[PDB]
Structures are given as structure tokens and as C-alpha cells.
Design a protein around this ligand. Structure first.
Ligand SMILES: CC(C)(COP(=O)(O)OP(=O)(O)OC[C@H]1O[C@@H](n2cnc3c(N)ncnc32)[C@H](O)[C@@H]1OP(=O)(O)O)[C@@H](O)C(=O)NCCC(=O)NCCS
Length: 160
């Protein structure tokens, strides 16, 4: 059923992708420095300062997005802005796209490790990365937009 493809993000994709976060919690999870409501301008500013912004496509629809917010040649990349269209969740889009990003870290950056950080409330995120072989390494305190204390779970995975 799912025949996924990927390509670099394009201008025309930004309206779609900016529609993906459904609430303030989802935006915080994937882009904690953004302010609700999300906007194309905020997404474009992330793209401009990051690397590897990639979309996943199925049946002619952009269904997922990700990029790197850290990249260190020969060392590691950190994967962020991971978001999937709400109508397409639970179908393997993030799994697919994380694979693609792992290959790109290996290929382009000669990375031996992928890092991700997932906020504590985001069970789907934590289970996603656990299923894909990431292990938790540390927990950092952060604050949410209401000033409330949250836990940021830093995970990683060897790439090879
Ligand atoms: C988290 C998110 C990216 C998952 O994307 P997705 O394409 O729906 O996930 P996939 O279908 O590829 O799922 C892969 C794994 O993620 C986990 N997962 C995804 N959705 C889940 C849910 N609703 N509940 C529990 N686990 C879930 C599971 O471990 C799943 O593996 P399995 O189906 O073999 O059990 C998506 O829910 C999303 O965009 N959320 C808002 C943004 C966000 O939180 N981003 C940061 C998290 S990466």
C-alpha cells in the first residue's frame, strides 16, 4: 500500500508542512523555539538555518518532513523538525523518513551517530525512536511555553 519517496523540501511544500502541527504541544515537541501559531515564515527560518530539509511523499502528497539542526562531519547529526501529516500518522512515514535521514547523515556527513531529543510528554516520539534502535543517554530540564518544567530525553543510535 505505502509507496514512499523522498526529495529535498521545496517552497511549494511549506504551506503543507506548516499545517502539520495540530496544537501547541505538537509544535513544541518538534520545534520548541517556535511560537504558536506556526507559520510558513517560522518554518522557512528553520530551513535556512538547518541542513537536509527533506519531505516524504506518498500518492502525490507531502506527508512528512525532517531536517538536521546539528551536523558535525565524521561525528554525528542531530535530527529535528520531525513532523507528519495528521491524516497520515501511524503508517510508517516517520520510520521511513528517519531511515532516509540516517542514510543522508552517513553519506553526506560521515556520521557515526544520530542524536535526537524528545520531550517527556511525547510518548509517540519516545516509542518511535525506541522502535528504531535509539537508546536514552541523558535527561535535561527545559521549560515549556507556560514556564512549566519538562524533561528533554536525549537519545542516540550508532549509524555505521
Ligand atoms: C511522532 C510522529 C512523527 C510519528 O510519525 P508517524 O509517521 O505517525 O510514525 P510511524 O508510523 O512511522 O511510527 C513508527 C513508530 O512510532 C511509534 N508511534 C507512532 N505513533 C504512535 C502512537 N500514536 N502511539 C504510540 N507509538 C507511536 C511506534 O513505535 C511506531 O512503531 P510501530 O507502528 O511499529 O509500533 C508523529 O506523530 C508526529 O508528527 N507528531 C507530532 C510532531 C512530533 O511530535 N515530532 C517529534 C517526534 S519525532
Amino acid at each position: 500500500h505505502m509507496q514512499l519517496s523522498h526529495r529535498p523540501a521545496e517552497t511549494g511544500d511549506l504551506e503543507t508542512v506548516a499545517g502539520f502541527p495540530q496544537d501547541r504541544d505538537e509544535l513544541f515537541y518538534c520545534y520548541p523555539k517556535a511560537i504558536w501559531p506556526f507559520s510558513v515564515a517560522q518554518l522557512a527560518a528553520a530551513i535556512a538555518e538547518r541542513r537536509g530539509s527533506t519531505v516524504a511523499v506518498h500518492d502525490g502528497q507531502v506527508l512528512g518532513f525532517a531536517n538536521f539542526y546539528q551536523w558535525q562531519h565524521g561525528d554525528f547529526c542531530a535530527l529535528g523538525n520531525m513532523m507528519v501529516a495528521p491524516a497520515a500518522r501511524g503508517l510508517g512515514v516517520a520510520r521511513y523518513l528517519i531511515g532516509v535521514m540516517e542514510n543522508l547523515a552517513r553519506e553526506q556527513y560521515k556520521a557515526r551517530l544520530m542524536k535526537i531529543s524528545c520531550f517527556n510528554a511525547n510518548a509517540a516520539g519516545l516509542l518511535l525512536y525506541t522502535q528504531l534502535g535509539y537508546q536514552p543517554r541523558a535527561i535535561a530540564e527545559r521549560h515549556d511555553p507556560d514556564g512549566r518544567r519538562v524533561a528533554l530525553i536525549q537519545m542516540d543510535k550508532p549509524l555505521e
